[PDB]
Amino acid sequence: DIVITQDELSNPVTSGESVSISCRSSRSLLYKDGRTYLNWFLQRPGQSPQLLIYLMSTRASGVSDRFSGSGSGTDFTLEISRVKAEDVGVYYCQQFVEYPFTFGSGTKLEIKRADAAPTVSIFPPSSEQLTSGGASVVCFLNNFYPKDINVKWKIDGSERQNGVLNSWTDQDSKDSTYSMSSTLTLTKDEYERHNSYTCEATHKTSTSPIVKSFNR
Amino acid sequence: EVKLSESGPGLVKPSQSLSLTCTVTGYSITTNYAWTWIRQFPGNKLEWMGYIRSSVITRYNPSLKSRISITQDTSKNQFFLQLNSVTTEDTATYYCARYDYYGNTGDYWGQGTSVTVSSAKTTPPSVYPLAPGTAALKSSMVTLGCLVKGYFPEPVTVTWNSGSLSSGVHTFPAVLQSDLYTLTSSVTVPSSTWPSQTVTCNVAHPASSTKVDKKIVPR
Ligand SMILES: COC(=O)[C@@H]1[C@H]2CC[C@@H](C[C@@H]1O)N2C
Ligand SMILES: [Zn+2]
Ligand SMILES: [Zn+2]
Ligand SMILES: [Zn+2]
Ligand SMILES: [Zn+2]
Ligand SMILES: [Zn+2]
C-alpha cells in the first residue's frame, strides 16, 4: 500500500507572500501513459474536501490561478501564490496510480499576522438552566492573536479550577485570528453561595490580564 | 447542475450494520464514473473505501475485508454503502464523490454525514440563552450567545435568525464528557440592532429529530 507523508504544519505565512506545501510518496506515481496521478485537495473547517489540482499539475475547473503544482515521481509540491486569509485549512495530496487509493496525512496552512487583544464577554447562568439545578457561567474570548491564551476563573476573589471546560476554533478565514470559549459549571446551590464571578484572560498583547466579571 | 447528498443514521451500536445513501441529482449514475465513498476519522485521516461505476462494476479497500458492499438503485439515481459488524473504530464522517479516470472530482462531493458507533443513548440538547448581565458601553457592539448542553451524538446545527445573521458568528467545537456533548456559539452585533431587533438562535439535533429556537432577551 502506497504511503504518502506530509508535514503536519507549515511555517506561518503572511498574507501576501507565497508558500510551498510538499508531499512525498513511497512509490513513483508516474503511470505507463506518461501522466503522473497525484491530486491536491483543500479542506476548510466544517467543509468537504475541494479539488485544486489533478494529474500533478492540472488545475481543476474554477480553481484560482494562484495555485500550481509540480513534482518528479516521489516528491510533489503545491505552490500557493499571494496567500490570502481564505486559503486557511488543511491540504491533502492523493495518489491515483494504484489501488487502494490513499491520501497523505494533511498539512495545515498557518497564517501569520499582527498581534491582537481578544474581546472578552462573560455571561451569568440563564434562568432556564437554573431551574434544572445546574449553573454554567460562560466566557467568550474572540478574535485574538497569537493563538496562545490563558483564561482564569475566580469566585469571590479566589481561583477556581474544577468544573471548567474549554474550546478553541480553527484559524479565522476572514481575519486570521483565533477564538475561544470557556465554561465554568457549578451546581445551582454552589452558584448561590457566592456573589462575584470573574473571567481573566492573559495574552501577549498585554502585561495586565483582561478581566470581566459580574455580581450575582 | 450536479449535486451529491449523503443520508443515513447518525448513531449505530457496535457489531451492528451501517447503511448510507448518496442521492445524485443533475447527472446519471449509469455513466462510467467512479461513484465512490470516502471517510474521514476524528483526527482528519482520510480513507478510500470503494466505488461503483457503470452500474455493475465495483472495487473495495482491502482493509475493509469482506464487510463492505456498494450498490445502486438506478430508478432513484442513488448508490449505497453497507458496512457490517462495525466497531467504535468506524466512527467517522462519510462522504460520497464522483471521481473520473484521471482522478478529477470537480466540486462533485457531498456535504458528508457523521456516523458514531457507540452503546450510549441518543439525548436531545438543552438550549440556553446567553444575554449580557447589564448594559455595557453604549453606541458600540454587544455579544450574545447560546449554550447547547447535554446532547448525544454529534452533530448539531446552529444558526442565527434562520441564517439571515451570518457575519460575526462563532460556533465553538463541542466538548465531550460523560457520553454527553456541550457546545457554545456567540454572535456580535451593534448595540443598536439589539435589543431593538430580535436575535434568535436555531438549534437542530438530527439524531433526536429535535429542533429548538431560543430568542435572546435582556436580563
Ligand atoms: C488501480 O487502478 C488505477 O490506478 C487505474 C490507473 C489508470 C488511470 C488511473 C485510474 C485507474 O483506476 N490509474 C493511474
Ligand atoms: Zn503498504
Ligand atoms: Zn471570525
Ligand atoms: Zn462555595
Ligand atoms: Zn441541478
Ligand atoms: Zn428501483
Which among A126, A155, A144, A136 is positioned nearest to A180, based on CA atoms? A144
Query: B147, A138: Cβ pair inside 8 Å?
Result: yes
- Burial per residue of B38-60, b for 16 or more beta-carbon CB atoms within 10 angstroms, e otherwise: bbbeeeeebbbbbbbbebeebeb
Is residue A98 lining ligand 1, measured as CB closer than 6 Å? yes
The answer to whether the beta carbons of residues B153 and A148 sit under 8 Å apart is: no
Measured by CA distance, the residue closest to atom 6 of ligand 1 is A97
B32 Cα to the center of ligand 4, angstroms: 68
The answer to whether the beta carbons of residues A120 and A139 sit under 8 Å apart is: yes
Which among A189, A114, A198 is positioned nearest to A156, based on CA atoms? A198
What chain A holds in terms of domains, given with CATH numbers, is 1-113 (2.60.40.10), 114-216 (2.60.40.10)
Which among B13, B30, B10, B55 is positioned nearest to B151, based on CA atoms? B10
d(CA A72, CA A28): 9
Query: A61, B106: Cβ pair inside 8 Å?
Result: yes
Which candidate in B46, B49, B134 is best for mutational testing of the A interface (most A CBs within 10 A)? B46
Residue A189's H or E segment, with its range, is helix A188-192
Query: A181, B184: Cβ pair inside 8 Å?
Result: yes
d(CA A151, CA B99): 46
Q: Which residues of B touch A180 (CB under 8 A)?
A: 172
The answer to whether the beta carbons of residues B100 and A89 sit under 8 Å apart is: no
Burial class from Cβ neighbours inside 10 Å (0-12, 13-18, 19+) for residue A111 reads buried
Hunting for cell 440563564 — which residue is that? A126
Any residues with CB less than 8 A from the CB of B117 and at least 6 apart, and which? Answer: B11, B12, B13, B14, B18, B86, B87, B88, B89, B90, B91
Among A39, A128, A140, whose Cβ lies nearest the Cβ of B103? A39
DSSP B120: S
C-alpha distances (whole Å) from A200 to each of A51, A120, A132, B21, B91 are 43, 9, 27, 48, 37
The answer to whether the beta carbons of residues B160 and B209 sit under 8 Å apart is: no
Cell numbers that stand for B217 in this block:
432577551
d(CA A39, CA B47): 14
Query: Is the CA virtual torsion B84, B87, B89, B93 positive or negative?
Result: positive
- Per DSSP, the residues of A59-100 read EPTT--TTEEEEE-SSEEEEEE-S--GGG-EEEEEEE-SSSS
This structure's resolution (angstroms)?
2.1
The answer to whether the beta carbons of residues A81 and A21 sit under 8 Å apart is: no
d(CA A118, CA B147): 20
Which among B83, B124, B175, B30 is positioned nearest to A182, based on CA atoms? B175
Nearest Cα of chain B lies from the Cα of A101 at a distance, in angstroms, of 6
Max Cα separation, chain A? Answer: 76
Is residue B101 lining ligand 1, measured as CB closer than 6 Å? yes
Assign domain B120-219 one CATH number from 2.60.210.10, 1.10.357.10, 2.60.40.10, 3.30.43.10.
Answer: 2.60.40.10
Side-chain-side CA neighbours of A174 within 13 Å: the count stands at: 8
- Burial per residue of B88-118, b for 16 or more beta-carbon CB atoms within 10 angstroms, e otherwise: eebbbbbbbbbbbeebbbbbbbbebbbbbbe
Burial class from Cβ neighbours inside 10 Å (0-12, 13-18, 19+) for residue B123 reads middle
Max Cα separation, chain B? Answer: 67
Cis peptide, bond prior to residue B195, ω within 30 of zero: yes
**Which residues, in sequence order, are bridge partners of residue A46?**
none
The answer to whether the beta carbons of residues A66 and A80 sit under 8 Å apart is: yes
The answer to whether the beta carbons of residues B38 and B48 sit under 8 Å apart is: yes
Which candidate in B39, B48, B180 is best for mutational testing of the A interface (most A CBs within 10 A)? B48
Count of A-B CB contacts under 8 Å: 128
Answer whether B140 touches A (CB < 8 Å): no
Torsion angles phi and psi, residue A41, rounded to 5: -120, 155
Which among A185, A151, A155, A193 is positioned nearest to A168, based on CA atoms? A151
Nearest Cα of chain A lies from the Cα of B37 at a distance, in angstroms, of 12
B23 Cα to the center of ligand 6, angstroms: 13
Question: How many other C-beta atoms lie within 10 A of the C-beta of residue A12?
Answer: 14
Which among B192, B210, B40, B197 is positioned nearest to B115, based on CA atoms? B40
d(CA A122, CA A136): 11
d(CA A42, CA A106): 9
Query: Is the CA virtual torsion B100, B105, B106, B109 positive or negative?
Result: positive
Nearest Cα of chain B lies from the Cα of A16 at a distance, in angstroms, of 24
Torsion angles phi and psi, residue B52, rounded to 5: -140, 135
Mutate to test the pocket of ligand 1, among B54, B59, B101 (most ligand atoms within 8 A of CB): B101
Which among B110, B205, B218 is positioned nearest to B158, based on CA atoms? B205
d(CA A114, CA B203): 35
Answer whether B61 touches A (CB < 8 Å): yes
Assign domain B1-119 one CATH number from 1.10.3720.10, 2.60.40.10, 3.40.50.2300, 3.60.10.10.
Answer: 2.60.40.10
Query: A35, B102: Cβ pair inside 8 Å?
Result: yes
C-alpha distances (whole Å) from A198 to each of A152, A178, A194, A211, B121 are 8, 22, 12, 7, 35
DSSP-H helix ranges across chain B = 193-196
Atom number of ligand 1 nearest to Cα B101: 10
Torsion angles phi and psi, residue A188, rounded to 5: -60, -40
Which among A14, A28, A133 is positioned nearest to A74, based on CA atoms? A28
Any residues with CB less than 8 A from the CB of B56 and at least 6 apart, and which? Answer: none
- As annotated, the residues of chain B forming the CATH 2.60.40.10 domain(s) are 1-119, 120-219
Experimental method: X-ray
